[PDB]
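Checklist before submission:
- one chain only
- standard amino acids only
- sequence pasted in full

Submission:
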Amino acid sequence: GAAIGLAWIPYFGPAA
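Returned file contents:
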């Protein structure tokens, strides 16, 4: 979704 439900990973990097 990249809306809100998935707003934890950014810590590791959006383009992991």
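Reviewer check: The CA atoms of residues 4 and 10 lie 11 Å apart.
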